[PDB]
Amino acid sequence: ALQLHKQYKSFAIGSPEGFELAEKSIYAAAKSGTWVLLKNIHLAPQWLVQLEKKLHSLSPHPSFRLFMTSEIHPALPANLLRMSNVFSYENPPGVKANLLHTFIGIPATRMDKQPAERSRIYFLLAWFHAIIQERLRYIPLGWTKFFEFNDADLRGALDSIDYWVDLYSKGRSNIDPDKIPWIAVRTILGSTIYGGRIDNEFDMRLLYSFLEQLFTPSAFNPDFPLVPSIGLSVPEGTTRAHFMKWIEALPEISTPIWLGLPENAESLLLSNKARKMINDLQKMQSSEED
C-alpha cells in the first residue's frame, strides 16, 4: 500500500463499531477506487455471510482493490474464498529460515551496543528459539504437544537478557560470562517466558535441556559446538552483520540431528506426509466416482 502509493485504509474486525464503519468506508472505497484492508475477519463468523453477498453484487472501478486478511479458519464462507485470489502463508521449514525471521526483529541498533558479548547472547537466544520451534514439526518426537513459542517470547527474552547485561556491565565494553547469573537467566526464560505454556513434566525437561546447553558460561568459549556431527559451531563475532553472514552461509535444509533428534525423525515426517497426500488423492477420486 505504501510501496505502490494509493489511499489505504485498514480495520480490525471484532468490535461492534468495527462492523459498520467498514461496510461504508469500503463501499465508498469502491467508486472512488482506493484500497481497503480488513484483518481477522474470521472473528466475525456470523458477519462475512453479509460481506460476501454484498461484495459479490458490488461492481467497482478498475483501480479498486479490497485486501482482506485471515487465518485458515473454517468460518470463512466458500463464496468469499471463491470470489477472491487466495494467497497462502506458511512458516517455511528450516533452522536457517527460522533464524532470518527472528533477526528481522533484532535491529543492529539494539544488538550492536556494548558489551560486545551482548550480540553473542542474542544469537544464542535466536538459535535456541529456532531449535525448539523446528522440533515442533516433529510431534510427538520433537515435543509432546504443539507449544506456541511465538515472536513475543523472543522479545521478552531479549528484555530479560538486556536486564542482566545492564546490571553486570552497564556502561562497559565487556562483560564476564562467569559473573552472570545463568541459572537466573535460564529460569526466567524457561519457566516464565517460553515454558509457562508447558503442562507436561518431560517437555519442561526438554526445554531446560536446551536452555542449559546454550546459556552457560562455557558457551562463550570460541568454537562452541551447536551441531557437532556436521562441524557447525557458534561464529566469533560482535555485530549483527557478523552473525548474519554466518546465518546466510547455512544450508537451506536442516536435519533433525540439528535439533538433537535422530535423523530418522525425518522418516516419520516424510511418511505422515505421504499418508496425508495418498489420503487426499483418494478423496478427490471417491466423489468423482460416487
Binding site: 480490525a12 471484532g14 468490535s15 461492534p16 468495527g18 481477522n40 472473528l43 466475525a44 463468523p45 487465518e71 515435543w143 509432546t144 504437544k145 504443539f146 507449544f147 506456541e148 511465538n150 515472536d151 513475543a152 521478552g156 528484555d159 536486564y163 547469573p181 541459572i183 537466573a184 529460569t187 526466567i188 519457566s191 516464565t192 517466558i193 509457562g196 505454556r197 508447558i198 503442562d199
Partner: protein, 572 residues
C-alpha cells in the same frame, strides 16, 4: 447505586452495603456516637482498624471528597500501623508465646502476616550473608531460623485448639499457613550446599519483602521482590479473607505472573477446573496489597458494565481477573478481548493514558484471564491477546501439601500422614464408586472435610523409648478418628446406598486400625421413635440413621437438598 449513594451522602448507614463494591476488604466505616465522623474501617469477617487521622463527614466535605479521604487514611493508617508492628515485634521474645500472641492482636491480620514475612526475609538474607561464609556456618544460621519458626508453629499449633473468635481463629490459621511456607523454603535452602549468599538464586527465586524506613513516603517503605521484579505494596485493606497454601505450583505461578506484570503483559493461568487458577491470582493481588476484582464469565455478562469497569480498573490501577474467560459468547469474547488489547498495548508501551471507546492509566493495574487448555498444547486465548499475555499452566495442584498445611492450621499434629491418606482416598472414591453426577471430590470438597474435622476436633478430647511409642500411637489414632468422624458427617450422607459398602471398605484400607462410629443422638433417636409409632411409620435403623444425617447436616449448612428416587422416604 451511585445515585442512591450520592443522595444518602450524609446518611452513611445507608451507603455501607455498597462498600463491598468499591473496596476489596473495607466493608463498613465505624462512625462516632453522633455518626458524624469516621473513626475506622470494618471487614466482612468483623475485624476492625481505627484510622490514625479521623475523618469528618459533617465539617463540609461532599460525597467523593470524604470517600477520597477514607481511601487515603486506609492506606495511610495501615502503612503507619505496619511500622508500629515492626517496632513491636522487633522487640519480642519469640519463645514467650504470651507477649507474642499479645502482638498478633495489636494488629490487622493483613499486617501480622507482612510483619512476619518482612522479618523472615531479612533473617534469611543475613544467614546467607554477603557471599563469604563457609557453607557449614550459613547452614547453621538456617537451622536456627528453620528451627525457631518450627517452635512458633507448635505454640500456634496448640492455640487454635483453645476456644477463640472466628476472627482470631482465621488469623492464626493464616499465620500457620505463612509460617509453614517460611520454614519450607528455608528447608529447601538447607539442601543447598554451594550457596552464593544473599544473592544465590535458590533464594532470589522466592518472594521476599524488604522494609526500608529510611525512605520518605510510608507507602514506598515496603518493597516486594521476586526474582528480579519489584513491587510497592498497595496498602488496600483486605480484611482477613483468605490465604492459599504456598504450594510449589503456587510459587511457580507467582514467578510467572510477577514476571508478566514486570514485562507489562497480562496473566493467563490455564488448566482444568478446580486447580487453583482464579484463587492464585487473588492471593497474589492480596500479597502485593492490590484490589482484585474477579469477573464470572459463565453467566449473563454485562458488556455495558464492563466498559465502565475497565475505566476504573485503569483509573485505580486495580486488578481485573476474568474467570473462565473463554466460556463467553463468541461475540462478547471479541468485545472484551478487543478492549483488553487496547489497554494491554497501552501498558506495554507505558503510556500514562488509554484511548478506550483518552483516560489516565495507572501503571499498577493488571489484567488476568483464566481458562481451560486449548487443543493439543495450543492456547485458548484469542489471537489478538496471544502475544500480549504470559500464560502459566496449572494442571496438577499440590493436593497432598495443601491438605497437610490445611490440617496443621486446624490443630492436627499428624497432618503429614493424614494428608498422605485423605488425598489418595478421595482419588479412589472418585474412580471406584458409582458415577452419580452429584459426587464432588475436588479440592474444595477435600477442604470441607478438613475444615469440619477441625470443628469436630474442638469438641473432642485426646486420651523409656517403648513409652513415647505407645503414647504417640494412641494420640495418632485419636486424630485419625476425628478425620473419620468428618468423613461420615460430610461424605457418606450424599453417597447412594450401593456406594456405602464400597466407601466403608475403602476407608478401612486407608485407616486400618480405626472404624466408623455410630451416631450418639440418644435423645433424638427416642423422640423420632416416639413419633414413628404415632405416624404408623416402621422405625428402621437404616431409616432413622438418615434423619440424624439431616439433623446433623442442618446444624451446619443453611441450605440442604434431600435427594433420591420417588418413594424413598424423603418427605416422611
Amino acid at each position: 447505586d451511585l445515585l442512591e449513594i450520592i443522595g444518602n451522602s450524609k446518611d452513611i448507614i445507608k451507603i455501607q452495603k455498597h462498600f463491598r463494591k468499591m473496596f476489596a476488604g473495607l466493608a463498613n466505616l465505624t462512625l462516632d456516637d453522633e455518626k458524624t465522623t469516621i473513626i475506622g474501617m470494618s471487614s466482612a469477617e468483623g475485624e476492625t482498624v481505627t484510622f490514625k487521622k479521623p475523618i469528618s463527614i459533617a465539617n463540609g466535605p461532599k460525597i467523593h471528597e470524604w470517600l477520597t479521604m477514607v481511601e487515603s487514611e486506609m492506606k495511610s493508617t495501615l502503612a503507619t500501623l505496619l511500622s508500629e508492628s515492626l517496632q513491636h515485634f522487633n522487640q519480642v521474645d519469640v519463645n514467650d508465646h504470651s507477649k507474642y500472641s499479645e502482638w498478633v492482636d495489636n494488629y490487622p491480620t493483613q499486617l501480622v502476616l507482612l510483619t512476619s514475612q518482612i522479618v523472615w526475609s531479612t533473617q534469611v538474607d543475613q544467614a546467607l550473608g554477603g557471599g563469604t561464609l563457609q557453607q557449614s556456618k550459613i547452614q547453621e544460621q538456617l537451622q536456627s531460623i528453620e528451627q525457631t519458626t518450627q517452635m512458633i508453629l507448635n505454640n500456634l499449633a496448640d492455640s487454635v485448639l483453645q476456644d477463640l473468635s472466628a476472627q482470631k481463629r482465621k488469623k492464626f490459621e493464616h499465620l500457620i499457613t505463612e509460617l509453614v511456607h517460611q520454614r519450607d523454603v528455608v528447608r529447601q535452602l538447607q539442601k543447598c550446599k554451594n550457596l552464593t549468599g544473599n544473592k544465590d538464586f535458590d533464594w532470589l527465586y522466592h518472594m521476599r519483602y524488604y522494609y526500608d524506613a529510611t525512605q520518605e513516603n510510608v507507602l514506598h517503605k515496603l518493597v516486594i521482590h521476586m526474582a528480579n521484579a519489584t513491587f510497592y505494596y498497595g496498602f488496600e485493606y483486605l480484611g482477613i479473607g483468605e490465604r492459599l497454601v504456598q504450594t510449589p505450583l503456587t510459587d511457580r505461578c507467582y514467578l510467572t505472573l510477577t514476571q508478566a506484570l514486570e514485562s507489562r503483559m497480562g496473566g493467563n493461568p490455564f488448566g482444568p477446573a478446580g486447580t487453583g487458577k482464579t484463587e492464585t491470582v487473588k492471593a497474589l493481588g492480596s500479597q502485593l496489597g492490590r484490589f482484585v476484582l474477579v469477573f464470572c464469565c459463565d453467566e449473563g455478562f454485562d458488556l455495558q458494565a464492563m466498559s465502565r469497569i475497565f475505566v476504573g480498573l485503569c483509573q485505580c490501577g486495580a486488578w481485573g481477573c476474568f474467570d473462565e474467560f473463554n466460556r463467553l459468547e463468541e461475540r462478547i469474547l471479541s468485545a472484551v478481548s478487543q478492549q483488553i488489547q487496547t489497554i494491554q498495548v497501552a501498558l506495554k508501551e507505558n503510556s500514562k493514558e488509554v484511548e478506550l471507546l483518552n483516560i489516565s492509566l495507572h501503571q499498577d493495574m493488571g489484567i488476568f484471564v483464566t481458562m481451560n487448555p486449548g487443543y493439543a498444547g495450543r492456547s485458548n486465548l484469542p489471537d489478538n491477546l496471544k502475544k500480549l499475555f504470559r500464560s502459566m499452566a496449572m494442571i496438577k495442584p499440590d493436593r497432598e501439601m495443601i491438605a497437610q498445611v490445611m490440617l496443621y492450621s486446624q490443630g492436627f499434629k499428624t497432618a503429614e500422614v493424614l494428608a498422605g491418606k485423605i488425598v489418595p482416598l478421595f482419588k479412589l472414591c472418585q474412580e471406584q464408586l458409582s458415577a452419580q453426577s452429584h459426587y464432588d471430590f475436588g479440592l474444595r470438597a477435600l477442604k470441607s472435610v478438613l475444615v469440619s474435622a477441625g470443628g469436630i476436633k474442638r469438641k473432642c478430647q485426646p486420651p523409656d523409648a517403648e513409652s513415647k511409642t505407645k503414647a504417640d500411637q494412641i494420640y495418632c489414632q485419636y486424630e485419625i478418628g476425628v478425620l473419620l468422624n468428618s468423613i461420615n458427617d460430610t461424605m457418606i450422607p450424599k453417597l447412594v446406598a450401593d456406594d456405602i459398602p464400597l466407601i466403608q471398605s475403602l476407608l478401612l484400607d486407608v485407616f486400618p486400625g480405626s472404624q466408623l462410629q455410630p451416631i450418639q443422638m440418644d435423645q433424638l433417636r427416642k423422640k423420632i421413635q416416639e413419633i414413628a409409632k404415632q405416624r404408623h411409620l416402621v422405625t428402621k435403623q437404616e431409616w432413622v440413621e438418615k434423619i440424624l444425617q439431616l439433623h446433623q447436616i442442618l446444624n451446619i449448612n443453611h441450605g440442604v437438598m434431600m435427594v433420591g428416587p420417588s418413594g424413598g422416604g424423603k418427605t416422611t
